[PDB]
Design a protein around this ligand. Structure first.
Ligand SMILES: CNC(=O)c1cnc(C)s1
Ligand SMILES: [Zn+2]
Ligand SMILES: [Zn+2]
Length: 582
């Protein structure tokens, strides 16, 4: 308790000595409260005018237009301690899983150079504003690194002074760049060296790309077994127990020297003990603390969520297969059975799963898995939108399974070759491309973000009639040499000024390990669409009068945007489509 968090609390107390009151009407039950102090401040979603002017039919579709307008009583709940049997299953599984992930990888510190290079090409590191303006400036200043140095030596000494969370079914925990650096130095290797690649972790999909996920789910479907299960957890980050954080910390057992000590400090001082500052309109700042739940950087959060989800799903698989009888207590002979199961079939069972942080697909040995709920519920990983003891409903067809906000279609090219393509409701895709985040966007920067969405659509969603047409229109409306941009950056192959037909050939043919015939495609007309009825099912406006008028008059929309941007060099991409080709 206060021996580990006091120093952080003490330091904040003194910087607001004018305002420090132990408020009596504090709304916290599950968070430890410590005091308040005076502040006054808040970043709404802005519309992308280039994308909206080229998607006129969607101006009267509420599912699109409502997306641009506008639970923290789930962060303030508690999770019960798992039973002894459950704690044993988790410890055995976690020990085995770090060893498997460690067989072909070496833990190592990430460098100031790697961190500096990240900041100097806009990765969402979740930092705050203040002594330097931006991340780019602090990183190019020796003073910062001396603050970093002071904290670093405090961590080597087993103590913390400045590693404090700022809070803002979501919740992002920003830290100061320094605390983020020290987290990246100790634990960045999990992402930087691809510990959760499919090659390394067998269940993972880190670095795979949306053009691979469908083929991965089809490969899982080919295993003998029961239905495909895709159960969502209700508020995964809030269900991470102190036992989970201790099993995650066992990655330090594989480390040595300075690295081991720096990593043990991140786990002990920032993950297993947290200090957080939260805005309350009653506007004050509350300084609250707790031991459990997930609150790390978003990239470390991804890897540790993937780890703990892989662990939880192996245990649910063990329950279904009858490897243990009860979570109350593991007998000596059940422990050896669980160890033996892991050694003999553990790697096969990992290959039955696709796991992306809190998101999973499992094809178990049989459907006993559906009603194997005791360990899953006792670990606190309670399923969303189903009663606690109601058996899971599985999917009979891999093309219906939800994963990473998508489903996947099997699409046969006129030449017989097979594409497995990503898909989601088209209102969601159009609504997202019509939104920007943040202030000070020039017309050029707005155009270049629209171009990033257009090129993503050409590469991932070419099979949706409306998106191939809208992508061609946006790429015709934005100057040909202007470079696509994002502000918060899976593999992003559409972020390029290379010709999109050349990129399509590289991604779907040349580098596609599921495509045996490497014959390049010569034009966009060789590249197929979904069935017309399937395209409508997934939200196409094909068949509507609004959509017909838009398609017919598209050159008028393109010319409106070109007139706003001004006298620049543009390319007409519309004749790449049969209907504009004379
Ligand atoms: C006596 N039970 C066991 O040792 C195992 C159960 N399932 C395995 C693959 S090994
Ligand atoms: Zn610290
Ligand atoms: Zn679809």
């Amino acid at each position: 308790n206060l021996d580990i968090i006091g120093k952080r609390i003490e330091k904040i107390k003194q910087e607001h000595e004018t305002s420090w009151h132990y408020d009596q009407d504090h709304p916290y039950k599950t968070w430890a409260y410590h005091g308040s102090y005076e502040t006054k401040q808040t970043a709404s979603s802005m519309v992308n005018g280039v994308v909206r002017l080229l998607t006129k039919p969607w101006d009267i579709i509420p599912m699109v237009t409502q997306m641009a307008m506008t639970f923290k009583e789930k962060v303030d709940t508690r999770t019960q301690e798992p039973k002894e049997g459950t704690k044993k299953l988790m410890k055995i599984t976690a020990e085995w899983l770090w060893k498997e992930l460690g067989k072909k990888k070496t833990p190592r510190m990430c460098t100031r150079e790697e961190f500096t290079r990240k900041v100097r090409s806009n990765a969402a590191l979740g930092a705050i504003f203040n002594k330097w303006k931006s991340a780019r400036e602090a990183v190019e200043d020796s003073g910062f690194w001396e603050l970093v140095d002071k904290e670093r030596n405090l961590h080597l000494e087993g103590k913390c002074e400045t590693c404090v969370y700022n809070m803002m079914s979501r919740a992002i925990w920003y830290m100061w760049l320094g605390a983020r650096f020290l987290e990246f130095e100790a634990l960045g290797f999990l992402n930087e060296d691809h510990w959760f690649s499919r090659e390394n972790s067998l269940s993972g999909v880190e670095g795979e790309g949306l053009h691979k996920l469908g083929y991965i789910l089809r490969d899982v479907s080919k295993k003998e077994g029961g239905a495909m299960y895709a159960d969502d957890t209700a508020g995964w980050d809030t269900r991470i127990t102190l036992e989970d954080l201790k099993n995650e910390e066992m990655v330090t057992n594989h480390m040595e020297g300075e690295h081991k000590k720096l990593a043990e400090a991140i786990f002990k001082l920032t993950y297993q003990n947290k200090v957080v500052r939260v805005q309350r309109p009653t506007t004050v700042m509350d300084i609250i603390s707790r031991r459990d739940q997930r609150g790390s950087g978003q990239v470390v959060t991804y890897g540790l969520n993937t780890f703990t989800n892989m662990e939880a799903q192996l245990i649910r698989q063990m329950e279904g297969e009858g490897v243990f009888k009860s979570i109350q207590h593991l007998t000596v002979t059940e422990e050896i059975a669980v160890k033996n199961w892991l050694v003999r079939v553990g790697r096969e069972r990992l290959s039955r799963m696709a796991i992306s942080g809190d998101d999973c697909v499992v094809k178990p040995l049989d459907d006993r898995f559906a009603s194997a709920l005791t360990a899953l519920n006792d670990m606190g990983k309670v399923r969303k939108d189903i009663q606690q003891w109601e058996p899971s409903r599985g999917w009979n067809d891999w093309t219906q399974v939800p994963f990473c906000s998508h489903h996947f279609h099997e699409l046969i090219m006129k030449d017989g070759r097979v594409l497995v393509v990503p898909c989601r409701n088209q209102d969601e895709l159009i609504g997202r491309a019509r939104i920007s985040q943040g202030a000070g966007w020039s017309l050029r920067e707005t155009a270049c973000l629209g171009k990033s969405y257009a090129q993503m659509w050409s590469l991932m969603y070419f099979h949706r009639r409306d998106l191939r047409l809208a992508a061609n229109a946006i790429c015709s409306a934005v100057p040909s040499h202007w470079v696509p941009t994002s502000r918060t950056t899976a593999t992003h192959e559409w972020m390029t000024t290379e010709d999109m037909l050349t990129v399509w050939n590289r991604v779907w043919i040349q580098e596609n390990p599921w495509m045996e015939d490497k014959t390049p495609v010569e034009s966009w007309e060789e590249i197929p669409y979904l069935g017309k009825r399937e395209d409508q099912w997934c939200g196409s406006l094909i068949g509507l009068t609004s959509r017909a008028t838009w398609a017919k008059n598209i050159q008028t929309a393109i010319n409106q945007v070109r007139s706003l941007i001004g006298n620049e060099e543009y390319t007409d991409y519309m004749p790449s489509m049969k209907r504009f080709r004379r």
